Design a protein around this ligand. Structure first.
Ligand SMILES: [Ca+2]
Ligand SMILES: [Ca+2]
Lengths: 186, 105, 53, 298, 298, 52, 53
């Protein structure tokens, strides 16, 4: 089986407050909590990015709608954040619980797509580079879910943004899909 | 409680290496509970979500006396702070030479 | 472990209270430490030269 | 010695006709299953087993019902009298009795058969099936416990005795052990040791217009549920029954039975399920309780 | 010689009541199936067969449960005792013992039967069905291994001996081989040779406030999982159980049991399944381990 | 010294009376103040001879 | 490694026709791993996703 860390909703109305006293002295944003329960995931279908289908899993503990599920793997992913710099990143599959049935089978939605929900973006923002759109989309002050900054490969999002149809107001989902198709990334 | 003495309802008892289990990320109200019908073990301790002191007169009537004596605040991993409950002395008339007040009159 | 004292013993062995147990009880009632005392002169002490009775 | 089965119309009630199915004219033989089934919800990932929650299922009980009449007239009269008595009451209580135990089941009549294959003097061999409401529950008598004052002994207790003006000595182990309490007769514990579901308590109130009923305390001395009634006049006794199927509340005065449900404290009565702790009487001179707690397999 | 079946209420626990179903009063006979079933997911393209992943499915074991009482009273007393002991614990452990092996199964009560077909002195012959949680797991005591210094030999070892000022010769094959290491008592390997699923370790911690608990190393000396707790005071022993069904993480100090779940490092504890490599003790004076490892067919 | 005798071991020493003497006899005597450490007081009336 | 000598933690060893399998389209960090408890084979090589010294 796979190990799961169940946390309550990463409410930005709570965690987006710089009142945490750091050991040096200065104030930083509230850190993520400890899992309310450590459980194990059985009878699962887990998607890495959630480009086409939504994930599903039957969890041992009785999770509820809103809770964040962190699926753990005993392996490490090396991500290149700077030209030469690489960092030891532990393998994780982070989802938001959308619905739980009678048999405790939880419908899991990939954290990113559940974060950029209901967010609309005008044509004015699509005029600049792809970096400006990513910097707009990922913001814990606007988003439904908490985020402590993105990690991005400059070379892939260096290019000029794709031209909008009718130069209208598009949703964060439609623009991300349009951008992620051209940049060939998820 | 390694070595704590308590007087509740005029009844003296000692807590000698007596452990009370706590609720995580909570304010735990530690109570001394006295049930005189429990002849072998009349006193027991509890950690509760609120101050549930009941003022039951155990020396004149029946019932369980519950009295809060400690407030223990926790994180998800352990104790963050402890605050004792105030010990009230109700008196009629006092004759004194000198007094020191740390709080207020 | 909880050591009960101001409680009756039906088999006359259950809750025995010792000198130190009552000693701790009396200290809490009056509100004294091991650095202070409770003293009362029922009759004034006599002074005979370099002696105090 | 041998096993005794008994069918009851209104067990815990006054109008209880009892049918001795082991001994009497109508007989229950060869029970289908007296055991139990359980669904444990065990899902296994990569050979290692994880267990869910076990739903303890009870299977129907089917008896070989034989009649022992003297004529065709007598056997037809038994089948008609027995089956209709089971139909008159919404549920019929069975009693499983042996040398070691006496338990009860609250069966509901599922299926009864009537055929024309008659044995001698029009006797019957038929199958009677029952659906289970509650399978195995004890019907114990609950009574309060009294507290007694410990004996006074010279040197061991707290007294100022012997030479004037009295003396009590501190000793290692012996010291002063208090005798008892002035008016110890004031302490009475109605002890609850195991979890109960339903109970048939008769309660006689003391004063009219003062809330009368029973309250329940947990192991820490906190109240969880209380059946509290308020009355205008003193009802000789309040006859409360917690059974879900035939829940009964009624204040008896003389020969008149009054329904006390609308006059009961709805906020205090939080649950029917009684937990481990104690029970206290509010405005009650006397009480007689009959406790009925579960047993899955017996 | 012959096969031994034993039922344990709580294997790996102090409160372990053992029922000898081979020798005792309550006996298990004729197991339905001790083998296994597998679903291989074989899909075929144009006559050629492609095989997926094999889900090894374990089937229910049904035993012919017999009682060996001396009276009707004793046989009823066995059925009531044996079945309720199985019900008291959420899951029961079977012990399949033979001349060559000693395997265990984690069973859950599926179905038990009680009938009135009594043999002699109220004898019982009933069928008991069990649901499989985990089938066949070895329960063994895991201990560390010690390293000892090799003996010193003249000409073979690195020493300056014989005629002054000592001489060591470079030969072809025999040359110089180091004897051992100074303080070779520091080297201790807790060896993991096969993949293990759950374990019951009694951890003895050294320093308070320092993360105390075991970590697991893979074959290359890296960490995958670690059960590490950061306590305020020195626990006399930390009891850790990795069993999926009843996980225990309690820090005992004296006679007091403390829940160590919130104090645990959730990020370090990545998996329950231990892989081939070695175990390292973080801030521990002594350790006592019981390793359970699965076997599909035995 | 303030040695805890009721819980632990040791000899408890505590002053209660101060006696000022001359070559012949006692000149003056002053008793040690009786300290009453309390948490909170609910009182009707009070009389102070020294100060607060 | 056809003939490579390495000193790691002051311990000398030689890699004589020692092959290390690599991950495709990746940066492989080749490590020398020394485990003194493995008496017969104390040294082993690994190809890893990061520098795990
Ligand atoms: Ca009834
Ligand atoms: Ca166990």
């Amino acid at each position: 089986m796979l190990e799961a860390n169940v946390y309550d909703n990463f409410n930005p109305n709570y965690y987006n407050i710089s009142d945490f006293s750091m050991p040096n002295g200065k104030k930083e944003k509230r850190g993520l909590p400890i899992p309310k329960a450590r459980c194990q995931v059985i009878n699962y279908e887990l998607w890495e990015t959630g480009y086409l289908y939504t994930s599903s899993a039957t969890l041992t503990v009785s999770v509820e709608v809103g809770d964040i599920v962190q699926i753990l793997f005993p392996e490490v992913v090396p991500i290149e954040e700077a030209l030469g710099k690489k960092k030891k990143l532990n393998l994780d599959m982070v989802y938001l619980v959308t619905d739980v049935d009678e048999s405790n089978k939880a419908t899991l939605k990939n954290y990113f797509w559940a974060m950029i929900e209901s967010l609309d973006v005008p044509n004015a923002i699509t005029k600049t580079t792809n970096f400006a759109i990513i910097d707009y989309l990922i913001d814990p002050n606007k988003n439904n879910l908490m985020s402590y900054g993105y990690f991005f490969n400059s070379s892939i999002f260096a290019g000029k943004a794709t031209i909008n149809r009718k130069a209208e107001t598009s949703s964060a989902h439609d623009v991300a899909k349009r951008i992620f198709s051209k940049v060939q990334f998820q | 409680y390694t070595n704590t003495s308590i007087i509740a309802g005029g009844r003296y008892f000692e807590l000698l290496n007596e452990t009370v289990a706590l609720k995580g990320d909570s304010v735990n109200y530690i109570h001394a509970n006295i049930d005189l019908t429990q002849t072998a073990n009349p006193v027991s301790l509890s950690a509760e979500t609120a101050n549930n002191s009941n003022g039951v007169d155990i020396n004149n009537g029946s019932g369980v006396l519950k009295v809060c004596f400690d407030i223990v605040t926790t994180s998800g991993t352990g104790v963050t702070s402890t605050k004792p409950i105030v010990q009230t002395s109700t008196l009629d008339s006092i004759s004194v030479n000198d007094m020191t007040v740390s709080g207020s009159i | 472990t909880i050591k009960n004292f101001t409680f009756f013993s039906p088999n006359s062995t259950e809750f025995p209270v010792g000198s130190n147990n009552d000693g701790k009880l009396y200290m809490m009632l009056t509100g004294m430490d091991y650095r202070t005392i409770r003293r009362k002169d029922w009759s004034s002490p006599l002074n005979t030269a370099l002696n105090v009775q | 010695m041998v096993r005794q089965y008994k069918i009851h119309t209104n067990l815990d009630g006054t109008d209880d006709k009892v049918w001795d199915v082991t001994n009497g004219k109508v007989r229950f033989y060869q029970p289908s299953n007296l055991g139990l089934q359980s669904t444990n919800n065990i899902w296994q990932s990569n050979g290692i087993g994880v267990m869910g929650t076990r739903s303890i299922t009870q299977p129907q009980i089917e008896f070989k019902l034989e009649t022992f009449g003297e004529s065709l007239e007598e056997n037809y009269q038994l089948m008609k009298d027995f089956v209709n008595d089971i139909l008159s009451k919404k549920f019929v209580t069975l009693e499983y009795q042996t040398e070691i135990f006496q338990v009860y089941a609250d069966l509901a009549l599922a299926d009864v058969t009537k055929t024309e294959g008659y044995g001698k003097n029009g006797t019957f061999s038929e199958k009677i099936t029952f659906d289970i409401i509650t399978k195995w529950y004890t019907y114990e008598n609950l009574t309060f416990d009294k507290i007694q004052n410990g004996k006074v002994i010279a040197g061991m207790s707290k007294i100022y005795g012997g030479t004037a003006p009295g003396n009590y000595k501190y000793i290692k182990g012996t010291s002063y052990t208090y005798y008892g309490e002035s008016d110890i007769d004031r302490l009475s514990r109605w002890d609850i040791k195991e979890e109960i579901f339903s109970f048939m308590g008769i309660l006689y109130p003391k004063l009219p217009k003062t809330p009368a009923g029973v309250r329940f305390l947990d192991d820490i001395g906190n109240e969880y549920t209380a059946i509290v009634f308020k009355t205008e006049q003193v009802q000789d006794y309040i006859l409360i029954n917690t059974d879900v199927n035939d829940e009964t509340y009624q204040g008896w005065k003389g020969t008149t039975a009054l329904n006390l449900f609308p006059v009961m404290d709805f906020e205090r009565y939080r649950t029917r399920i009684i937990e481990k702790g104690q029970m206290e009487l509010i405005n009650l001179s006397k009480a007689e309780f009959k406790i009925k707690r579960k047993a899955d397999f017996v």
